[PDB]
Design a protein around this ligand. Structure first.
Ligand SMILES: [Ca+2]
Ligand SMILES: [Ca+2]
Ligand SMILES: [Ca+2]
Ligand SMILES: [Ca+2]
Ligand SMILES: [Ca+2]
Lengths: 363, 363, 363, 363, 363
């Protein structure tokens, strides 16, 4: 083999959130080291229930990696999946596999002395970014307006507003208020978080049309593909969805329905970089736009490798976990130039680790 | 509410197999009790990796059941799924949910003093059954021949032979040998266990055509829907598949492709009775036949409720876990008449339990 | 068996209407009792011609229920259908079967000490409701306006206005008048009762778009599925139809055409709860909304069991037939908590019964 | 940038064939070197007219590579294509681009100290191989028989026989003769080289069915997708095609028609490794088998990276151009383990070079 | 044969542009003469990279024309294509073939003493024309406004404006300015040159709707057929595309998608008149409009032969190459009446020729 895995360590780290949304996020870290002295770091996560399950499964299948050639990433993804075949090809088991998968990609990239973006091959050195500016449905427009202004001032390229509350007139007012404040030149998008039924989504999308939003995210249930397809066919405003999906197959179904103008795959959630690339390949062929969701630390690299100009969300919740940081400038997020994912665990991770296990002999 | 859940207990029981094939099966038991004194028992399982993950997730979401009306089964399935939304609608998380789901159905049936089959409404009091007679690819033909003949004399209604070895001539020989021994009056089916590629499956199905087998099971990868549909369109022999799928959505895709003459949903594997019923409704409408896989203790009830004559496999591995037994006669297994699933945990379960947890106050 | 039917009584009851619409409605009541002392009550109906036919058929097939296990509801639906096979799977014969079907469901629910909603499993304890406030095309807007206001005051959650008269400008005026009176906050829907041809429906739907109605009901002939599908594709306003259909097959065709945003199945009209559930399963899978038509006494239970928020019409014409009543509060209809359908025949039913028959020996 | 391209050299080398079939093959070699001291070698080719055109275009666009980051392979493929946009996305211009593309991949692999197969990630360390044993339509049966048997004793895993001559009876005779000589255990395939019209292909495939050939290659015109799809739907024997196609788009069309059981993309012919990977992704998703055509020195690496067991032709014509060799044993060719493609130009290349050019300053 | 080719001369002529756009255009001229004394002139071209490749290939395959019957044009197109089969059916090789193809058509037309338009059969003696009036995105509206006015004054029938710059508000302003200047009676069209992504194209097309433009050209990537089809389905304004395509197959795909209201095939770019006619036949059958791109000297003849009123661009860049000129009158371009294409090489061609070759003996 090109090398061989000799040690693996998994940790279940509970990241406390500065502000309740959801008071914490369970992060599954996977560390892999080889006889050749190469090392990789990867992770998966669970918002709400899922952390314990991901860790337990990861611990059970980890031994299957020992002795294997780390360069055969897809092959190993398949081997770990087969090791837990009755668990399926999506959900907790493949998310656990994803932590290992990301680590192997990190390791291969470092082996070449290249950032993950350069190993895959990039199309740009910076990616369009946007943020919520710490805005929620319960955030007084006044505060959200001043926070969004600050974000723009520090380099954010767009603002995503939370909508989808029983009183639709409220959202329209809030959005109207933000648009008047920032100006027509600031890109604006909304996220309904699956709060609308088909009739309501139909009416709200109609109202938002004049706003020229970048996109309307998750207007319906994440699984209502025909519903999303119907909205995309009817309205000029792009429809964005997919962040809730957990496998290449689900994204394939969404794509088959032409249910999204902007596909929002979540690498950790779908099983890692390996399945994410298969999804990106399908989206590319279908001529769609890409807007990866969550984990910017990983997605900035994946987005950089997509043919068409993508959008990545500037999200700072995971920063305390790492020693590195992402920098933003003139509406764009810079793609890190360091080898691999360019991440190392902060000293704070230890204090937040509730479970851990390892197998093999460390080099 | 009709009632209120007050106590829940989950157990991870490792069933040792008298004959390695894999030397054990992880069973997740869920016990539910209410303020009204009602009780239910359900379970899910994992062959190979999966047991630890299912238990861990079940333990984390169990508290969400306390205080809820046990009669709103589908509603609670959704609540538990939402409680772990980032985990998706299939795989380990929904299988954990399935243990609770089965228990709720068991409890509702008992509440009406009806077997699960009668609660759902049955079409028959006994179901066609078949077995492998402890035969595997490595079992010497002559042994499998006397074993099969023995199963027939005990009342089994059919024999499923394992095939799919590199030397197709061998399988053809073994099947020919079995057919000549038992006679043309004994129903025969084969299981290739996803071992054939499209070209090989094409040639083997061609050869088996004259045999008039009941079905050819899993000739291709469980996810090659187009491949299976092509075989079903070409050959007279029914194609059976679906045992590997873990969600209603995956079965829906298989059904959309018309990839199976006999659909083989596995209740515990797809998330319980609730999603299984949705799958059965889709199969019924599509005019397909049903042959549920594994867990006869549960599937005999579900099969009894299907409009068209189904087939259920009679296999003994799980018996040690329960105090009750399935009866077979004249080629069919009798649908139990006791309330609910008609199962209670044996004293052996305790000794095989490696993990357990409970929440709430037992009535 | 779980039990066995020993007595059956059918009655043809003619319900006189307080105000001509249609001066009466023929109701077919079915009573079923078992050796175990269990009892069930169900019914079907005919607006205009149909009462005599339903009763005659019910009387002829009733004997087929004696001795049968009441828990095998679907099986018995099929047996009664086969008993009159040349009559088909829809229309008068299956509507007669439906009376028996509803009774069997009522009996099974009572057996478990659960309301019908809880036996099926509910998603809500109350359902959105609406009414016409005794409004017809010939009702002076002035009166309809004050009546609608009263309905809202007593808890009704929406108002359905009758439209579809030769003078379209009239309907627009009437609707404009009602909207201005009640305010934009009161949900409003219209019912054209199949009075428009494709061109007219096209023009009227266009005009109603700004109104933001909950739905436009039966704009075209109940059987013009392509016509309805075209309207739904073109307009934001939901299209509602299906109330005239009499079988799962017809609803399946409507669904295949994507001819309705809100499907309006009528349990009694399609053959009872058994076929209604098959229809609801198809609508659920297609991602549609549900708005059962007529018989709120039965549909409130069925609606409660649907995944997505349905709408049920508050209709008081059938009240004199029963001793129980439905209560409405804050725009919602409360789902009864009593066992089964929660209905018993009033003493007035006897005086209105024109035909009756029974078979078997009462327990 | 990760690095920077500083020098590029292109050579048009005419490979003389020891045996006319066409007496030579024009090979376009591309050498790329960077400021960081990294180097890559790639190539494209033309059988018959094409060599001069490929070189001329390569020379004209080569300057566009100077100063660029060699790691952004896909990006540069697009830049060179845009540099000659009026030339399209297929044919001579993209084949010229492919020589550079292969060199960039070779360079990236070497950068990581990995073979091309390991950089991409492999599923196997050896690939099934087959050869023609120097047999053509004019080769006397008995000679081809001893030649084939010889290839088998040296380790070849299969024999491809050339067919498609006006006298079909002859082919059938020759194939029958070969089959009887080698035995039923030696895999056999035939290549009709687009010689049959639909009617003839239909009859010949019918006759070959009993033979159980691995595949029937190019039975019809390379562009008759409907024709090929019809044959594949009708016959058990796999249909193989695609070797003549020159772009991802053409392969996509073939795949859309389901016109091939075995897709035969030719990396150099379609524009290099970059477009080849896109084609492989499409074939993988469609559930097809892979059998890359020509250039085993390159395809052995690409085939190793495909999920399902592929077939690669072992043919010796290009060996004189390189200092390295492919090893075969037990019916499979070993995937080279050296860095990158594992190829270096032999001293003979210089003598066969008719044209060459370079740009930039060599490090 | 009807005659036989005895001499062929190819020249690579670099046409310098009066103003940078692109400072020159490579033109490939092909001259063919027969034993019968007949002669033909044709050409192909490359904007940016492509000239050297086209010439090199043309030189290599030219010998294949000697001795052949010039009247069998399609047959010879196929023979030359086969002569370079590994080069494919599009791109540089077929463009080289196209130069010869045009010459053969010119020769056949002259043989009959008919213009090319009359040989094919025409529907009109003049064709609607339009121009850019030397306008580019960087041209100050003031100048573009006065230039467009002059064009109209000298007989041009329409104005095409360049759009597709980052600042969409700019294009709208420029177009608004031009429309106000020339008046609503002057046909206006825009060309976005593939500068918009789907979302942007969607928004810009919406804005342009009120303008009643003749068409919106290349709003998206030339290969995004689904994208173009979606725009055409949604908007009243015709979508025009196809100028970038290089083969009948690509145009066929575009047509299959109903991706264009106005198809813009480029004869030289797709391989000559032979493939252009196949494309025109497909467009005619699909009921589309035709707007050939570039080379008016050739397209005026081809456009004249199309059933529906086409549009041809008045483009003067190629004039210096020929001794003849096209005349425009009352918004239409007159179809030349001279034999064949009606073109002869100017004395300036010699000075601009960088490469040339000939084969055979001149008559
Ligand atoms: Ca859209
Ligand atoms: Ca079949
Ligand atoms: Ca609609
Ligand atoms: Ca086939
Ligand atoms: Ca249009």
């Amino acid at each position: 083999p090109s090398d061989r895995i000799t040690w693996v360590r998994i940790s279940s780290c509970y990241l406390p959130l500065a502000t309740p949304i959801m008071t914490e996020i369970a992060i599954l870290f996977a560390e892999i080291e080889t006889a050749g002295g190469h090392q990789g770091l990867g992770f998966s996560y669970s918002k709400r229930a899922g952390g314990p399950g991901q860790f337990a499964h990861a611990r059970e299948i980890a031994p299957a990696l020992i002795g294997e050639d780390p360069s055969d990433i897809a092959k190993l993804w398949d081997k770990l999946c087969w090791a837990g075949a009755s668990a399926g090809r999506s959900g907790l088991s493949t998310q656990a596999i994803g932590a290992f998968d990301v680590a192997l990609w990190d390791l291969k990239a470092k082996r070449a002395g290249l950032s993950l973006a350069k190993l895959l091959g990039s199309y740009r050195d910076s990616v369009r970014c946007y943020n919520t500016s710490g805005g929620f449905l319960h955030t007084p427009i006044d505060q959200l307006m001043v926070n969004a202004s600050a974000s723009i001032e520090r380099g954010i390229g767009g603002i995503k507003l939370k909508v989808g509350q029983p009183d639709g007139a409220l959202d329209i007012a809030r959005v109207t208020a933000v648009r008047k404040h920032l100006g027509d030149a600031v890109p604006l998008m909304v996220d309904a978080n699956q709060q609308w039924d088909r009739p309501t989504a139909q009416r709200m999308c109609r109202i938002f049309e004049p706003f020229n939003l970048v996109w309307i995210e998750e207007p319906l249930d994440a699984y209502d593909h025909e519903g999303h397809a119907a909205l995309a066919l009817q309205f000029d405003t792009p429809i964005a969805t997919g962040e809730m999906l957990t496998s290449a197959a689900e994204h394939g179904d969404l794509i088959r329905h032409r249910a999204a103008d902007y596909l929002m795959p979540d690498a950790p959630r779908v099983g890692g970089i390996t399945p994410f690339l298969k999804i990106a390949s399908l989206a590319e062929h279908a001529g769609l736009m890409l807007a990866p969701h969550f984990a910017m630390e990983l997605h900035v690299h994946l987005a950089a490798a997509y043919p068409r100009e993508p959008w990545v969300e500037h999200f700072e919740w995971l920063e305390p976990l790492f020693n590195e940081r992402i920098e933003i400038r003139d509406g764009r997020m810079l793609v890190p130039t360091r080898p691999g994912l360019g991440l190392t665990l902060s000293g704070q991770v230890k204090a937040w680790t509730r479970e851990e296990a390892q197998v093999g002999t460390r080099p």
